[PDB]
Design a protein around this ligand. Sequence first.
Ligand code: CL
Ligand code: ZN
Ligand code: ZN
Length: 349
Amino acid sequence: ETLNPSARIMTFYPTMEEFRNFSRYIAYIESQGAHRAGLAKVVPPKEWKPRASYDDIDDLVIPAPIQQLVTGQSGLFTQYNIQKKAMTVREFRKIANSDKYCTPRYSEFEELERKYWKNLTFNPPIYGADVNGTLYEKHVDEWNIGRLRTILDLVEKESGITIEGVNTPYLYFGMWKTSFAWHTEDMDLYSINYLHFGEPKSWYSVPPEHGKRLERLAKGFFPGSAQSCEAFLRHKMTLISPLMLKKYGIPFDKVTQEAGEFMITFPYGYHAGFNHGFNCAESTNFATRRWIEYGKQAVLCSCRKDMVKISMDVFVRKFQPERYKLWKAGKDNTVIDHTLPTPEAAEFL
Ligand SMILES: [Cl-]
Ligand SMILES: [Zn+2]
Ligand SMILES: [Zn+2]
């Protein structure tokens, strides 16, 4: 409550020694109140590099590039995907850098951000999203998105369920104006995002303590979507501008991620954003002991059969043995305090 009261996005510069233990550092950033913004930036030490070069990925296949069709006005938009046939990085790069799709000329980010909100419904771009894979070299043990060693490993280790992009890494090849709509992670988990190379990625975040305020706003503007699904923002179609957020008093913050930087999203941290140009990011989900409760109380998409659903039993039996019986009977009336750090943050408090 007194740690990060403003709930502003925090930036961290770990040393090589701090950086070596991912789970310990995530507990440390939470002891500093980073989780209150719903998003944090971690700039790794200059000596750390996940790959020697990105010169050998020309023939890497993007199995399902998606053309992003956006419809809307007055800061409220719906984004529709059109799956295109498989393309290579080389082909995607030529398209992204061509006169038709390249980044417009601008001076400051505020000018580029205006250009994005003025032109998102025009000239639909192609997003090389959800590519199963990693760009990390095998020998890299620190912050390896392909093997983070978090309590989320219980899903594949005990339950045997593999949710692509949740417990496995995903690659994202971006181009100017490609977007990611307002959402929290599947099961309201955490996420890690590494920007491998290229142009920046800008983010907007709503603090988890104000997340319900954004949902009430979004439900009011899309009533049809609210009736059809009890968690329509998980469809990842809804784009809302910062000016619209300001108009309806939704607190938020913005940050620009650059090549070689990490972004951490926190349980029930709503986020949206866009790519400045040709780039590549790697992403996966992870958990701490704090997520377990968010996981049990997550409002999931009901309208779709293929949606990501984790059985919480195993997490409640291992980390909450006392509450298992009460939770199974439907008597666990636990009210999540969003300002509270993860139990592992104690050694820093
Ligand atoms: Cl490249
Ligand atoms: Zn996300
Ligand atoms: Zn749904």
